[PDB]
Design a binder for this molecule. Structure first.
Ligand code: POG
Ligand code: UDP
Length: 428
Protein backbone atom coordinates (compact mmCIF):
# COMPACT_ATOMS: atom_id res chain seq x y z
CA UNK A 1 0.00 0.00 0.00
CA UNK A 2 1.28 3.45 -0.92
CA UNK A 3 1.51 5.72 2.13
CA UNK A 4 1.27 9.52 2.33
CA UNK A 5 1.99 11.65 5.38
CA UNK A 6 0.09 14.97 5.38
CA UNK A 7 1.31 18.03 7.32
CA UNK A 8 -1.18 20.92 7.43
CA UNK A 9 -0.31 24.27 8.87
CA UNK A 10 -1.68 24.57 12.42
CA UNK A 11 -4.86 26.43 11.47
CA UNK A 12 -8.29 24.84 11.68
CA UNK A 13 -9.08 25.87 8.10
CA UNK A 14 -5.85 24.22 6.90
CA UNK A 15 -6.63 21.04 8.93
CA UNK A 16 -10.14 21.04 7.35
CA UNK A 17 -8.93 21.27 3.75
CA UNK A 18 -6.15 18.73 4.34
CA UNK A 19 -8.64 16.28 5.85
CA UNK A 20 -10.91 16.50 2.79
CA UNK A 21 -7.90 15.85 0.56
CA UNK A 22 -6.94 12.90 2.77
CA UNK A 23 -10.41 11.42 2.26
CA UNK A 24 -10.03 11.77 -1.52
CA UNK A 25 -6.70 9.95 -1.37
CA UNK A 26 -8.06 7.24 0.95
CA UNK A 27 -10.74 6.57 -1.67
CA UNK A 28 -7.95 5.96 -4.20
CA UNK A 29 -6.47 3.31 -1.84
CA UNK A 30 -3.67 5.36 -0.32
CA UNK A 31 -2.93 5.01 3.39
CA UNK A 32 -2.74 8.42 5.08
CA UNK A 33 -0.80 9.54 8.13
CA UNK A 34 -2.44 12.82 9.20
CA UNK A 35 0.07 14.79 11.28
CA UNK A 36 -0.65 17.77 13.54
CA UNK A 37 -0.62 18.93 17.14
CA UNK A 38 -2.91 17.15 19.54
CA UNK A 39 -5.18 20.17 20.00
CA UNK A 40 -5.73 20.32 16.23
CA UNK A 41 -6.18 16.55 15.90
CA UNK A 42 -8.84 16.74 18.61
CA UNK A 43 -10.60 19.58 16.80
CA UNK A 44 -10.77 17.89 13.41
CA UNK A 45 -11.49 14.27 14.46
CA UNK A 46 -15.32 14.85 14.52
CA UNK A 47 -15.11 15.56 10.78
CA UNK A 48 -13.66 12.10 10.00
CA UNK A 49 -16.31 9.39 9.47
CA UNK A 50 -15.44 6.14 11.19
CA UNK A 51 -15.25 4.35 7.84
CA UNK A 52 -12.01 6.23 7.09
CA UNK A 53 -10.16 5.37 10.29
CA UNK A 54 -8.67 2.19 8.86
CA UNK A 55 -6.89 4.24 6.18
CA UNK A 56 -6.48 7.72 7.73
CA UNK A 57 -4.44 7.55 10.93
CA UNK A 58 -3.68 10.54 13.15
CA UNK A 59 -0.07 11.15 14.19
CA UNK A 60 0.74 13.68 16.91
CA UNK A 61 3.42 16.27 16.27
CA UNK A 62 4.96 17.81 19.40
CA UNK A 63 5.88 21.48 19.65
CA UNK A 64 7.98 22.84 22.51
CA UNK A 65 5.73 23.34 25.52
CA UNK A 66 5.79 25.60 28.57
CA UNK A 67 3.26 26.69 31.21
CA UNK A 68 3.07 30.00 29.33
CA UNK A 69 2.60 28.24 25.95
CA UNK A 70 0.98 24.84 26.64
CA UNK A 71 -0.29 22.25 24.06
CA UNK A 72 -3.89 23.60 24.02
CA UNK A 73 -2.47 26.81 22.44
CA UNK A 74 -0.57 24.98 19.70
CA UNK A 75 -3.08 26.11 17.09
CA UNK A 76 -4.26 29.34 15.54
CA UNK A 77 -7.82 28.44 16.56
CA UNK A 78 -8.88 31.07 19.10
CA UNK A 79 -5.25 32.07 19.66
CA UNK A 80 -4.39 35.57 20.90
CA UNK A 81 -2.84 37.21 17.81
CA UNK A 82 0.16 38.27 19.89
CA UNK A 83 1.00 34.57 20.35
CA UNK A 84 1.16 34.03 16.57
CA UNK A 85 4.96 34.71 16.44
CA UNK A 86 5.47 32.07 19.13
CA UNK A 87 3.30 29.58 17.26
CA UNK A 88 5.35 29.95 14.07
CA UNK A 89 8.60 29.69 16.02
CA UNK A 90 7.46 26.59 17.93
CA UNK A 91 6.30 24.96 14.68
CA UNK A 92 9.74 25.46 13.13
CA UNK A 93 11.22 23.85 16.22
CA UNK A 94 9.11 20.74 15.59
CA UNK A 95 11.28 19.84 12.61
CA UNK A 96 13.33 17.37 14.65
CA UNK A 97 10.27 15.53 15.90
CA UNK A 98 8.95 15.63 12.32
CA UNK A 99 12.17 14.00 11.10
CA UNK A 100 11.78 11.25 13.71
CA UNK A 101 8.20 10.66 12.57
CA UNK A 102 9.24 10.41 8.92
CA UNK A 103 12.10 8.06 9.82
CA UNK A 104 9.76 5.79 11.79
CA UNK A 105 6.79 5.74 9.41
CA UNK A 106 8.79 6.04 6.15
CA UNK A 107 5.87 7.28 4.05
CA UNK A 108 6.26 7.16 0.29
CA UNK A 109 5.10 10.77 -0.04
CA UNK A 110 4.83 13.94 2.02
CA UNK A 111 2.09 16.48 1.32
CA UNK A 112 2.91 19.74 3.14
CA UNK A 113 1.39 23.20 3.64
CA UNK A 114 2.85 26.59 2.77
CA UNK A 115 3.84 27.76 6.27
CA UNK A 116 6.72 25.28 6.81
CA UNK A 117 9.75 25.57 4.51
CA UNK A 118 11.56 23.12 6.79
CA UNK A 119 9.15 20.31 5.88
CA UNK A 120 10.23 19.69 2.25
CA UNK A 121 13.86 19.97 3.45
CA UNK A 122 13.40 17.19 6.03
CA UNK A 123 11.66 15.04 3.41
CA UNK A 124 14.43 15.60 0.88
CA UNK A 125 17.06 14.61 3.43
CA UNK A 126 15.24 11.28 3.89
CA UNK A 127 14.68 10.81 0.11
CA UNK A 128 10.92 11.19 0.56
CA UNK A 129 9.23 13.04 -2.35
CA UNK A 130 7.23 16.01 -1.15
CA UNK A 131 4.37 17.96 -2.75
CA UNK A 132 3.00 21.29 -1.55
CA UNK A 133 -0.79 21.61 -1.06
CA UNK A 134 -2.31 25.09 -0.75
CA UNK A 135 -5.61 25.29 1.10
CA UNK A 136 -6.27 28.79 -0.22
CA UNK A 137 -7.28 29.65 -3.76
CA UNK A 138 -5.06 31.00 -6.54
CA UNK A 139 -6.22 34.61 -7.00
CA UNK A 140 -4.51 36.12 -3.96
CA UNK A 141 -1.28 34.17 -4.52
CA UNK A 142 -1.04 35.35 -8.12
CA UNK A 143 -1.86 38.90 -7.03
CA UNK A 144 1.07 38.68 -4.61
CA UNK A 145 3.53 37.25 -7.13
CA UNK A 146 2.58 39.53 -10.04
CA UNK A 147 4.20 42.77 -8.75
CA UNK A 148 7.46 40.91 -8.09
CA UNK A 149 7.75 40.41 -11.86
CA UNK A 150 5.70 43.38 -13.15
CA UNK A 151 5.99 46.19 -10.60
CA UNK A 152 4.67 48.81 -13.07
CA UNK A 153 1.86 46.87 -14.79
CA UNK A 154 -1.69 46.19 -13.50
CA UNK A 155 -2.61 42.57 -12.78
CA UNK A 156 -3.75 41.39 -16.25
CA UNK A 157 -6.84 39.18 -15.76
CA UNK A 158 -8.99 41.20 -13.27
CA UNK A 159 -10.43 44.69 -12.50
CA UNK A 160 -9.90 44.07 -8.76
CA UNK A 161 -8.22 46.89 -6.80
CA UNK A 162 -6.88 46.12 -3.34
CA UNK A 163 -8.19 48.69 -0.86
CA UNK A 164 -5.56 50.87 0.81
CA UNK A 165 -6.47 49.35 4.20
CA UNK A 166 -4.64 46.17 3.19
CA UNK A 167 -2.02 47.67 0.86
CA UNK A 168 -0.62 49.68 3.77
CA UNK A 169 9.28 45.75 8.85
CA UNK A 170 9.69 45.68 5.03
CA UNK A 171 12.55 43.12 5.45
CA UNK A 172 10.38 40.95 7.74
CA UNK A 173 7.60 41.10 5.09
CA UNK A 174 10.03 40.11 2.31
CA UNK A 175 11.28 37.15 4.37
CA UNK A 176 7.71 35.94 5.10
CA UNK A 177 6.92 36.16 1.37
CA UNK A 178 10.15 34.30 0.51
CA UNK A 179 9.31 31.54 2.96
CA UNK A 180 5.82 31.18 1.51
CA UNK A 181 6.99 31.19 -2.10
CA UNK A 182 9.72 28.69 -1.20
CA UNK A 183 7.09 26.18 -0.06
CA UNK A 184 5.46 26.37 -3.49
CA UNK A 185 8.69 26.53 -5.50
CA UNK A 186 10.28 23.61 -3.59
CA UNK A 187 7.35 21.31 -4.37
CA UNK A 188 8.20 18.26 -6.43
CA UNK A 189 6.87 18.70 -10.00
CA UNK A 190 3.42 20.07 -9.13
CA UNK A 191 1.68 22.35 -6.66
CA UNK A 192 -1.76 21.21 -5.48
CA UNK A 193 -4.35 23.91 -4.86
CA UNK A 194 -7.86 23.95 -3.42
CA UNK A 195 -9.58 25.59 -6.36
CA UNK A 196 -11.36 24.85 -9.64
CA UNK A 197 -11.00 26.14 -13.18
CA UNK A 198 -14.49 27.60 -13.61
CA UNK A 199 -13.57 30.15 -10.93
CA UNK A 200 -9.80 30.58 -11.17
CA UNK A 201 -8.55 28.81 -14.31
CA UNK A 202 -6.92 31.86 -15.86
CA UNK A 203 -5.25 32.74 -12.54
CA UNK A 204 -3.96 29.15 -12.22
CA UNK A 205 -2.38 29.35 -15.65
CA UNK A 206 -0.84 32.75 -14.83
CA UNK A 207 0.55 31.52 -11.51
CA UNK A 208 1.97 28.49 -13.29
CA UNK A 209 3.84 30.69 -15.77
CA UNK A 210 5.14 33.02 -13.05
CA UNK A 211 6.38 30.11 -10.92
CA UNK A 212 7.37 27.91 -13.89
CA UNK A 213 5.66 25.04 -12.08
CA UNK A 214 2.56 22.98 -12.86
CA UNK A 215 -0.47 23.99 -10.79
CA UNK A 216 -2.94 21.14 -10.26
CA UNK A 217 -6.40 22.01 -8.90
CA UNK A 218 -8.01 19.55 -6.51
CA UNK A 219 -11.08 21.59 -5.53
CA UNK A 220 -13.83 22.16 -4.51
CA UNK A 221 -12.90 20.53 -1.15
CA UNK A 222 -16.03 21.01 0.95
CA UNK A 223 -16.85 19.09 4.11
CA UNK A 224 -20.43 17.91 4.46
CA UNK A 225 -21.71 16.28 7.68
CA UNK A 226 -24.75 14.00 8.11
CA UNK A 227 -25.45 17.53 18.26
CA UNK A 228 -22.97 20.40 18.75
CA UNK A 229 -25.95 22.70 19.47
CA UNK A 230 -27.57 21.97 16.09
CA UNK A 231 -30.95 20.71 17.37
CA UNK A 232 -31.79 24.05 19.07
CA UNK A 233 -30.49 25.97 16.07
CA UNK A 234 -32.45 23.82 13.63
CA UNK A 235 -35.67 24.30 15.58
CA UNK A 236 -35.08 28.07 15.48
CA UNK A 237 -34.26 28.07 11.75
CA UNK A 238 -37.27 25.84 11.04
CA UNK A 239 -39.55 28.63 12.28
CA UNK A 240 -38.18 31.23 9.85
CA UNK A 241 -39.25 32.00 6.29
CA UNK A 242 -37.26 30.55 3.35
CA UNK A 243 -33.94 32.26 2.62
CA UNK A 244 -34.61 34.86 5.34
CA UNK A 245 -31.58 34.38 7.59
CA UNK A 246 -27.89 35.28 7.40
CA UNK A 247 -25.16 33.30 9.08
CA UNK A 248 -22.42 35.60 10.39
CA UNK A 249 -18.94 34.28 11.08
CA UNK A 250 -15.37 35.47 10.95
CA UNK A 251 -13.70 32.06 10.96
CA UNK A 252 -11.44 30.30 13.41
CA UNK A 253 -8.52 32.69 13.81
CA UNK A 254 -9.87 36.23 13.95
CA UNK A 255 -11.54 38.31 16.65
CA UNK A 256 -13.17 41.49 15.30
CA UNK A 257 -12.54 44.62 17.30
CA UNK A 258 -15.29 46.20 19.36
CA UNK A 259 -15.49 48.92 16.68
CA UNK A 260 -15.93 46.32 13.91
CA UNK A 261 -18.55 44.42 15.94
CA UNK A 262 -20.42 47.70 16.46
CA UNK A 263 -20.70 48.29 12.70
CA UNK A 264 -21.70 44.72 11.88
CA UNK A 265 -24.30 44.66 14.66
CA UNK A 266 -25.88 47.96 13.62
CA UNK A 267 -25.85 46.80 10.00
CA UNK A 268 -27.69 43.62 10.98
CA UNK A 269 -30.18 45.62 13.03
CA UNK A 270 -31.00 48.19 10.33
CA UNK A 271 -31.46 45.38 7.78
CA UNK A 272 -34.13 43.69 9.97
CA UNK A 273 -32.83 40.31 8.75
CA UNK A 274 -32.87 37.14 10.81
CA UNK A 275 -29.34 36.27 11.86
CA UNK A 276 -27.19 33.65 13.55
CA UNK A 277 -23.89 35.22 14.63
CA UNK A 278 -20.90 33.29 16.01
CA UNK A 279 -19.12 35.41 18.60
CA UNK A 280 -15.83 34.22 20.00
CA UNK A 281 -13.41 35.32 22.75
CA UNK A 282 -9.69 34.39 23.03
CA UNK A 283 -16.51 40.28 28.08
CA UNK A 284 -19.36 41.37 25.66
CA UNK A 285 -18.46 43.45 22.56
CA UNK A 286 -22.01 43.82 21.20
CA UNK A 287 -23.66 47.26 21.39
CA UNK A 288 -25.87 47.75 24.48
CA UNK A 289 -29.43 46.44 23.84
CA UNK A 290 -28.67 45.03 20.36
CA UNK A 291 -29.76 41.43 21.11
CA UNK A 292 -32.73 42.59 23.21
CA UNK A 293 -33.92 44.79 20.33
CA UNK A 294 -33.32 42.01 17.78
CA UNK A 295 -35.58 39.74 19.79
CA UNK A 296 -36.37 36.48 18.07
CA UNK A 297 -34.84 37.70 14.78
CA UNK A 298 -31.38 37.30 16.28
CA UNK A 299 -29.29 34.50 17.74
CA UNK A 300 -25.73 34.71 19.04
CA UNK A 301 -23.88 31.40 19.21
CA UNK A 302 -20.88 31.56 21.53
CA UNK A 303 -17.61 29.98 20.41
CA UNK A 304 -18.51 27.62 17.56
CA UNK A 305 -21.48 26.81 15.33
CA UNK A 306 -22.30 24.03 12.84
CA UNK A 307 -21.57 26.27 9.87
CA UNK A 308 -22.22 23.71 7.13
CA UNK A 309 -25.58 22.57 8.50
CA UNK A 310 -26.66 26.20 8.94
CA UNK A 311 -25.58 27.20 5.44
CA UNK A 312 -27.54 24.27 3.99
CA UNK A 313 -30.75 25.13 5.83
CA UNK A 314 -33.66 26.27 3.66
CA UNK A 315 -34.07 29.31 5.92
CA UNK A 316 -30.58 30.61 5.18
CA UNK A 317 -30.47 33.30 2.51
CA UNK A 318 -27.01 34.81 2.88
CA UNK A 319 -23.64 34.50 4.58
CA UNK A 320 -21.93 37.53 6.14
CA UNK A 321 -18.40 36.15 5.94
CA UNK A 322 -14.81 37.16 6.51
CA UNK A 323 -14.27 35.28 3.20
CA UNK A 324 -11.84 32.73 4.47
CA UNK A 325 -11.42 30.27 1.61
CA UNK A 326 -13.16 27.26 3.15
CA UNK A 327 -16.14 29.48 4.01
CA UNK A 328 -16.21 30.81 0.46
CA UNK A 329 -16.04 27.32 -1.06
CA UNK A 330 -18.74 26.04 1.31
CA UNK A 331 -21.00 28.97 0.51
CA UNK A 332 -20.55 28.38 -3.21
CA UNK A 333 -21.14 24.63 -2.93
CA UNK A 334 -24.29 25.26 -0.88
CA UNK A 335 -25.63 28.08 -3.07
CA UNK A 336 -25.64 30.75 -0.35
CA UNK A 337 -24.78 34.29 -1.52
CA UNK A 338 -21.89 35.87 0.33
CA UNK A 339 -21.90 39.34 1.86
CA UNK A 340 -18.18 39.82 2.15
CA UNK A 341 -16.62 41.50 5.18
CA UNK A 342 -12.97 40.44 4.72
CA UNK A 343 -10.52 41.13 7.53
CA UNK A 344 -6.93 40.28 6.52
CA UNK A 345 -4.51 37.87 4.74
CA UNK A 346 -6.09 36.28 1.66
CA UNK A 347 -9.62 37.43 2.59
CA UNK A 348 -9.74 40.74 0.65
CA UNK A 349 -8.67 38.89 -2.49
CA UNK A 350 -11.25 36.17 -1.86
CA UNK A 351 -13.97 38.80 -1.48
CA UNK A 352 -13.02 40.49 -4.75
CA UNK A 353 -13.09 37.12 -6.48
CA UNK A 354 -16.52 36.41 -5.04
CA UNK A 355 -17.72 39.82 -6.28
CA UNK A 356 -16.21 39.29 -9.71
CA UNK A 357 -17.80 35.80 -9.94
CA UNK A 358 -21.17 37.47 -9.30
CA UNK A 359 -22.02 35.00 -6.52
CA UNK A 360 -21.82 37.55 -3.74
CA UNK A 361 -21.12 41.16 -2.87
CA UNK A 362 -18.44 42.94 -0.86
CA UNK A 363 -19.18 45.47 1.86
CA UNK A 364 -16.66 48.23 1.14
CA UNK A 365 -14.56 49.88 3.81
CA UNK A 366 -14.25 53.63 4.36
CA UNK A 367 -11.05 55.42 3.27
CA UNK A 368 -9.53 54.97 6.71
CA UNK A 369 -10.35 51.24 6.65
CA UNK A 370 -13.43 51.20 8.86
CA UNK A 371 -16.38 48.91 8.23
CA UNK A 372 -19.61 50.74 7.35
CA UNK A 373 -22.84 49.75 9.06
CA UNK A 374 -24.77 51.34 6.18
CA UNK A 375 -22.99 49.14 3.66
CA UNK A 376 -23.65 45.98 5.67
CA UNK A 377 -27.32 46.93 6.05
CA UNK A 378 -27.69 47.88 2.37
CA UNK A 379 -26.21 44.63 1.08
CA UNK A 380 -28.19 42.37 3.43
CA UNK A 381 -31.31 44.32 2.44
CA UNK A 382 -30.63 43.89 -1.29
CA UNK A 383 -29.38 40.31 -1.27
CA UNK A 384 -31.48 38.68 1.48
CA UNK A 385 -34.38 40.70 2.90
CA UNK A 386 -35.77 42.27 -0.28
CA UNK A 387 -33.89 40.02 -2.77
CA UNK A 388 -33.57 42.81 -5.31
CA UNK A 389 -30.19 41.28 -6.30
CA UNK A 390 -31.80 38.42 -8.18
CA UNK A 391 -28.70 38.31 -10.37
CA UNK A 392 -26.51 37.39 -7.40
CA UNK A 393 -28.93 34.71 -6.20
CA UNK A 394 -29.12 33.23 -9.72
CA UNK A 395 -25.34 33.20 -10.14
CA UNK A 396 -24.97 31.56 -6.73
CA UNK A 397 -27.47 28.87 -7.75
CA UNK A 398 -25.62 28.31 -11.03
CA UNK A 399 -22.28 27.97 -9.25
CA UNK A 400 -23.78 25.47 -6.80
CA UNK A 401 -25.04 23.46 -9.79
CA UNK A 402 -21.57 23.41 -11.35
CA UNK A 403 -19.92 22.45 -8.06
CA UNK A 404 -22.49 19.73 -7.32
CA UNK A 405 -21.86 18.09 -10.72
CA UNK A 406 -18.20 17.49 -9.82
CA UNK A 407 -17.12 14.07 -8.66
CA UNK A 408 -14.09 11.87 -8.10
CA UNK A 409 -12.61 12.93 -11.37
CA UNK A 410 -11.47 16.21 -9.82
CA UNK A 411 -8.66 14.16 -8.19
CA UNK A 412 -7.54 12.30 -11.34
CA UNK A 413 -4.77 14.78 -12.18
CA UNK A 414 -3.29 14.77 -8.68
CA UNK A 415 -3.35 10.97 -8.53
CA UNK A 416 -1.58 10.71 -11.90
CA UNK A 417 1.13 13.18 -10.87
CA UNK A 418 1.67 11.32 -7.59
CA UNK A 419 1.97 8.05 -9.51
CA UNK A 420 4.52 9.49 -11.94
CA UNK A 421 6.57 11.22 -9.23
CA UNK A 422 6.83 8.04 -7.16
CA UNK A 423 7.77 5.93 -10.20
CA UNK A 424 10.52 8.37 -11.15
CA UNK A 425 11.94 8.75 -7.57
CA UNK A 426 11.89 4.95 -6.95
CA UNK A 427 14.34 4.78 -9.90
CA UNK A 428 16.53 7.59 -8.42
C1 POG B 1 3.44 36.60 -0.38
C2 POG B 1 3.68 37.35 -1.65
C3 POG B 1 4.10 36.43 -2.78
O1 POG B 1 3.04 35.54 -3.13
O2 POG B 1 4.69 38.36 -1.48
C4 POG B 1 6.02 37.85 -1.54
C5 POG B 1 7.01 38.99 -1.54
C6 POG B 1 6.93 39.79 -0.27
O3 POG B 1 8.33 38.42 -1.65
C7 POG B 1 9.28 39.31 -2.23
C8 POG B 1 10.52 38.51 -2.59
C9 POG B 1 10.17 37.20 -3.21
O4 POG B 1 11.31 39.26 -3.52
C10 POG B 1 11.82 38.44 -4.57
C11 POG B 1 12.71 39.26 -5.49
C12 POG B 1 14.15 39.19 -5.04
O5 POG B 1 12.63 38.70 -6.81
C13 POG B 1 12.87 39.66 -7.83
C14 POG B 1 12.72 38.96 -9.17
C15 POG B 1 12.26 39.91 -10.24
O6 POG B 1 13.95 38.32 -9.55
C16 POG B 1 15.10 39.11 -9.30
C17 POG B 1 16.33 38.27 -9.62
C18 POG B 1 16.43 37.97 -11.08
O7 POG B 1 16.21 37.03 -8.91
C19 POG B 1 16.70 37.08 -7.57
C20 POG B 1 16.25 35.84 -6.84
C21 POG B 1 16.00 34.70 -7.78
O8 POG B 1 17.21 35.47 -5.86
O1 UDP C 1 -18.33 28.63 13.93
C1 UDP C 1 -17.70 28.08 13.00
C2 UDP C 1 -16.72 28.78 12.33
C3 UDP C 1 -16.03 28.16 11.30
N1 UDP C 1 -16.32 26.90 10.98
C4 UDP C 1 -15.59 26.22 9.92
O2 UDP C 1 -14.21 26.51 10.04
C5 UDP C 1 -13.62 26.65 8.75
C6 UDP C 1 -13.08 28.06 8.62
O3 UDP C 1 -12.12 28.11 7.59
P1 UDP C 1 -11.97 29.42 6.68
O4 UDP C 1 -11.05 29.07 5.57
O5 UDP C 1 -13.33 29.87 6.28
O6 UDP C 1 -11.34 30.58 7.59
P2 UDP C 1 -10.41 30.54 8.91
O7 UDP C 1 -11.30 30.15 10.02
O8 UDP C 1 -9.44 29.44 8.97
O9 UDP C 1 -9.87 31.93 8.93
C7 UDP C 1 -14.72 26.44 7.74
O10 UDP C 1 -14.69 25.08 7.32
C8 UDP C 1 -15.98 26.68 8.54
O11 UDP C 1 -17.06 25.91 8.05
C9 UDP C 1 -17.32 26.21 11.68
O12 UDP C 1 -17.57 25.04 11.38
N2 UDP C 1 -17.98 26.82 12.67
Amino acid sequence: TTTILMLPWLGYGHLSAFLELAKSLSRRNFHIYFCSTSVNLDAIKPKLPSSFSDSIQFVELHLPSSPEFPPHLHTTNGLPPTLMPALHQAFSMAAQHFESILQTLAPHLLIYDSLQPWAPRVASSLKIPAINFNTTGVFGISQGLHPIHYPHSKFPFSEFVLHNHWKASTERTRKRGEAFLYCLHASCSVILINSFRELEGKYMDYLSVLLNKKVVPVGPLVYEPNDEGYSSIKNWLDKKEPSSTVFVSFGSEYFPSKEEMEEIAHGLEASEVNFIWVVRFPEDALPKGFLERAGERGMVVKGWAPQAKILKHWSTGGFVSHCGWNSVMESMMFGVPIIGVPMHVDQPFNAGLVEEAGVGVEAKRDPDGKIQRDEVAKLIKEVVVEKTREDVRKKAREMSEILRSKGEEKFDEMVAEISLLLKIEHHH
